[PDB]
Design a protein around this nucleic acid. Sequence first.
RNA 1: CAUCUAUAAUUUUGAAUAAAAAUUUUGCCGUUGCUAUGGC
Lengths: 121, 54, 46, 177, 67, 467
Amino acid sequence: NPKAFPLADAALTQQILDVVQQAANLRQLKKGANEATKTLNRGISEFIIMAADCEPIEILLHLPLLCEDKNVPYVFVPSRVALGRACGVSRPVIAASITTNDASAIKTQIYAVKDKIETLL
Amino acid sequence: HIAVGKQIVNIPSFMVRLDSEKHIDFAPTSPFGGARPGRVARRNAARKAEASGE
Amino acid sequence: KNKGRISRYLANKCSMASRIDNYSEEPSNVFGSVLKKQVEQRLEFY
Amino acid sequence: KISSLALITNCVQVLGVKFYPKIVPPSIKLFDASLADSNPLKEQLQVAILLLFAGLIKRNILDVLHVIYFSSSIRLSVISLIIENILKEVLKVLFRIWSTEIDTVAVSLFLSTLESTVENSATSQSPIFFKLLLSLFEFRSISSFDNNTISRIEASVHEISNSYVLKMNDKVFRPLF
Amino acid sequence: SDAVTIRTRKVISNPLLARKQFVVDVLHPNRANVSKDELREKLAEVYKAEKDAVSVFGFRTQFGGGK
Amino acid sequence: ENPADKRRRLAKQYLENLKSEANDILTDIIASRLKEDVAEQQGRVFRYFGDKLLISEAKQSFTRVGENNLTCISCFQPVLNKYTFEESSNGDKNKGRLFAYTVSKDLQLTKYDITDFSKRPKKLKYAKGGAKYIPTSKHEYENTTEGHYDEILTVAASPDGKYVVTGGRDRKLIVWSTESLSPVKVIPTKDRRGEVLSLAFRKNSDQLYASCADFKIRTYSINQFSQLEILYGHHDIVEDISALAMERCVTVGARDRTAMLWKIPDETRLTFRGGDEPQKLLRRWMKEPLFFCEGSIDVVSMVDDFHFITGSDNGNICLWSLAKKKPIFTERIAHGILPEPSFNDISGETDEELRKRQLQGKKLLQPFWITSLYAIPYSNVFISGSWSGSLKVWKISDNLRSFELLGELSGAKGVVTKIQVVESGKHGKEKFRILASIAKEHRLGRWIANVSGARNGIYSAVIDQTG
RNA sequence: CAUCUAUAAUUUUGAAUAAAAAUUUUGCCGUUGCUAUGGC
């Protein structure tokens, strides 16, 4: 399906999920479609991760509009349950937003993943 | 209050390495990450328990 | 109070339905019906 | 039967609202009734006897306690009423009723009475009390019970005896020891 | 709670001076500074020798305590 | 009358028994039996029944359990000592009464008897935590209320049979006396995020290793009720632990995909990293399908003192040896690919071809997680389990360089939280009960509940061997 | 833990009740027979 167009391969998924857990730990990550849209509106998002097997896909498919409107990288990953593990919560998550903060330890990681996402876009 | 790995460090210039910056935490002796609260807290507690007794 | 609870739950399900119907070429009474049943079951719980 | 219960409870109410030469003859008639009884009508009867005993003790103590013993939680409650209202005479009552006694529930109520009395002078009460312990040990010797049961009574009596000897002053019961 | 550990490393059996010479690590958390007498008692228990045969010396407590 | 004479008497009785059983076998051998009974502490696999097993005729039996989402299980099995000769069990009623303990998210501890390998595990006793044990300070080191109030997560039964010790999300750790299930001692982990994630006893000993999710590994001595040590070194939650007769343990830290082996007395650790590359795999297959890349390492068990097996969350089972840093033999998707989501439900649009395009073919397939893994100590068989509703029994080669699928068992259904094994019979004829705590959800978080027909229970499979 | 006790097993008396020795698979719902399996 080309609706979830940029879908990460195994390696890029690894690094994406790793930086997602890092940001969840330093608490630079907003979890959920609604809060992600909120960060997107406020323009505080470094980039967006989405699930690719949502039931159905449109409920989060709304996001790429705002993403590529405001020039914020976005990427799909295979499994929402994997994304939930990566975030560190008890329930499957479908879309999360890595926010932006200059005083972060994971700066260089987020920038590497965002680099590769942009290349893939 | 902050021990790297297992070893309390009290030098602010310490130049953590990579894995060390993963391992920083509160020391197992701190009132913050461990044992009984500090002197001010337990002095206040003694004061309040005594004043309740009287 | 449960008026506010149910109102907000309905708002969430409504937004999801709007997403589906906007980005689906020919939407499906199947998802409409199941989401309505979900809200109905919550209301029955109340 | 039901007529008797009605008479009983009417006596209960009238005495609670409220002479001796016409309050003891009903007591006598009531011991007669209790021994004659000693079926759910009979149980609720015995309850009525217990209730009127509670009222009269509130406002022959020996056979009163006899009927109380040989008549559960209600029984313990009325015992607590007995100890709160009414003590040397109570001690003689205890000794005589034990002699009459020598089953499980009666013995348990007996031990409860002893513990209540002792937690509730002592020189006067001492000798019959020690004779009572003598009798309880003889009961251990001749009782138709089980080892665990008899040991339960044994520990209880040792505790109460320790309490009473602690209460009493020493030089007075030296010869008693 | 408080469980002192005595463990040995670098055991070199030196039969010239008729002994075993080793390096002792004592893990004392939430405690200060285990005694040499207790060290000798427990070392004798472990090594099945006599507290008169065991000897230790030179104990330095690491920064932050517990070892 | 003398201790030495007593020991001689017991030993000669042992020899009488050995000679009688040797004659029975007949209807070298004695030296061999003695040497094996020695051979336990030298940590080379010696127990080689890898192919005498009769998997196809293993008798399978589910047993439902009341509470929901059993989290974990621990089995206690009395042995006979070889220094002395009394027994492993504590009292005298027991005399070889096989026990099991199950802990459930519903905050329940449940001990069963499984002595008879033909009847269902009988529920002897239980103890339930609950909300009434919530600490009144709630904000200090002391956390010492005599019960659990959140998500008991692991259990371990002491090899001497006196205590069983449980720990979970409440950041406590409670040792119970087995008979009355009574809580005898409570030890806090004293860390805000120090949740206990796994428990393992050093075999035949009273040193307990608790892998805790504050990135640490605590180590307690139980016959003294104290915390000996903390071991540091992981980067993510130290998700699972396993220990054997030596003074070592092995752990898997999850996200760093890192298995670390802890030699305690030396105070040293050895780091094992995986490192398959899917594109290399593709090139190699061209020289010769789907190659998922390793997400996290989930479960671990030592087969031996020098070899251990780690099941990850991308279908991989790796066999590692202490010599080489890379795994010596990795094995691909163990329990197959997770079934495809339905087209209608992925799409939300009635056009059938559009829905199929939504399903996207292969690119949304994922592998089953290895949720449980267990190697019978010092033996050459190990049991792997996922939520594919089938335990897989595997046998390692004799050279300890590879392993193959010995067989399957399809009686399970659900998420296999934990696997355990119990032996019985004579030294020549050994019956093997395989217990599995099965529930609907993975024990750490929810993440998953849609499984066809999962039921909370204990899955017991009795295996007999002939040859 | 040991012991005692309790429950439950036999012995004896009595057709038997009775008497004593003395001894030693589920939380909720469903399908399914003489155990197995559904759903919440």
